[PDB]
Design a binder for this molecule. Sequence first.
Ligand SMILES: [Zn+2]
Ligand SMILES: [Zn+2]
Length: 637
Amino acid sequence: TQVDQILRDIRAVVNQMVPKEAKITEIEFEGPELVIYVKNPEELIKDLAKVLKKRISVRPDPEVLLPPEEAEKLIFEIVPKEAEITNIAFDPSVGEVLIEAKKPGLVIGKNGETLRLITQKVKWAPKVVRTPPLQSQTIYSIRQILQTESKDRRKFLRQVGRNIYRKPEYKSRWIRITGLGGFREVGRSALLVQTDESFVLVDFGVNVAMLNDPYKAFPHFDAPEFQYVLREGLLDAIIITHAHLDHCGMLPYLFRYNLFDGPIYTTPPTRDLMVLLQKDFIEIQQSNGQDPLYRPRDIKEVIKHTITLDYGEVRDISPDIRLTLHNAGHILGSAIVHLHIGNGLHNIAITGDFKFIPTRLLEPANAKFPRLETLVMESTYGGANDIQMPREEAEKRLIEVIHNTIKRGGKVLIPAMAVGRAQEVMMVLEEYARIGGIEVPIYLDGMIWEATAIHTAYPEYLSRRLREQIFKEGYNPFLSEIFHPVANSRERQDIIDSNEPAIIIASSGMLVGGPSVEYFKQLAPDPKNSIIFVSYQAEGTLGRQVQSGIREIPMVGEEGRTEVIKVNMEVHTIDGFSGHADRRELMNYVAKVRPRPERIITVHGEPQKCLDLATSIHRKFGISTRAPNNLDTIRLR
RNA sequence: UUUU
Ligand SMILES: [Zn+2]
Ligand SMILES: [Zn+2]
């Protein structure tokens, strides 16, 4: 490394554009950003940063700070006690106190004055928030881990920084991308980006549809290049497109075996959401009497290593790679990953899963980038006939099936992952509720409610409409008194036994595990009940099996004896709520993406589909395309 | 409050 050698030049230009009265105590690197500590308060920053080509954060010296047990009631006083301040956390690792007030306007300073007045008394960065409608165990837990681990996090960030700046901006000699999983297949997405100077992992999923076979369930750990990057400790960073297990599922496995301790970049909502899905994942395994892939301490490590980034925020993550995340419109926090390699040498955009039309919760994926030579895109519906049903026709079909089900005295089972389709279908029923249509109750089972809480904590990540409809008003469609969160194992049993028709939405989305499987098993026989698939059912899942028509499904239970569930209930498939761009959308994304890429690489789709989309794009746009296999490596330059 |  030669970082402090570089800081020696940074410090020579910083202490050259700011009054010595600022008594600059220290200037170090914290993750991507540069930290300039000073022992005194107070347009300059904007200039300092535009010159240094970095993200600078200037805070008071960590010495002029007050303990969280003394600076708590010291602030609670210097604030108009009207704005109900539900909570008030502490972040000493970055000097910044969080004021989770119910009324932010009366706590920040009616005239932007109670902003600096308050900070003084304790010398902590005053940041106001609006007590979200729902409380999240997950968010609270993360906050707990971050504040009670300030020591490590500080150590970790300083290291990452010395790493990211082990040398000045570099122009790479070559660039290659290798598929470790998720190429010509759905699941276990994992793409390794290489240059002669760096290595970054884009996603690292698992395929729950096949944990039975680790060679089909995990990314290729058996790739020479990947083993070489892990063992030598050369992985600069891991980036996650979105929270689903098939993109971040194996991430904690990495810590369980001490294979990595570098930074993980992702949007805040994805950090919170993935942590949720991971705990949910190991617990479902255990409830099944199976040894879990990892444990809470491992997930605790993920948290401790994650460096969040909001959309549009450009950050240097290595000497020759610059990251920027953009909206993918797939699920809360979903991002298209953009890599600016070299200083104008080459640019890659990895799509992850994306939707290119509006939905209740999100806006179509970003299709504009400053530069874009190579585009890696998903192909879940890459087939030529993979046109999803129009959103409104689906919506109407969903209400239809429910009526023809409630009428004949039955229940409607809607399997869906805690994150994604669940909230989308919720909205559909919630708007339909406000106009008199939701008679029977709607039960949410499987951490779907916990996930819904996280949504309400991130209004800025939802569509502008749903966003304003959140904080600006005292309204919230998620709070709707029409959803009844299934509290425990018992309540679940009651619901099943009861005779009151009802709508049941529960994870997992593919009947691969969790609350959804119990309902399935118990409702299958009765033809009064109905099951509606509103998500892609992957090959190898009990879901696709049921969705395919199989009427007698063998299932292995305890003490090794198999069970044969008799499927009589009605089987319906409504794909119009999909979080995936359909065939038309994918093609249309290519047409609109700008700048037009030199080459497109189709991935994340059944083999035929990746092939089909790739062949189709080339034929219609004349763009160089390819549908690589895992372990294929494409030299981009 | 960095860039091609
Ligand atoms: Zn997904
Ligand atoms: Zn996926």
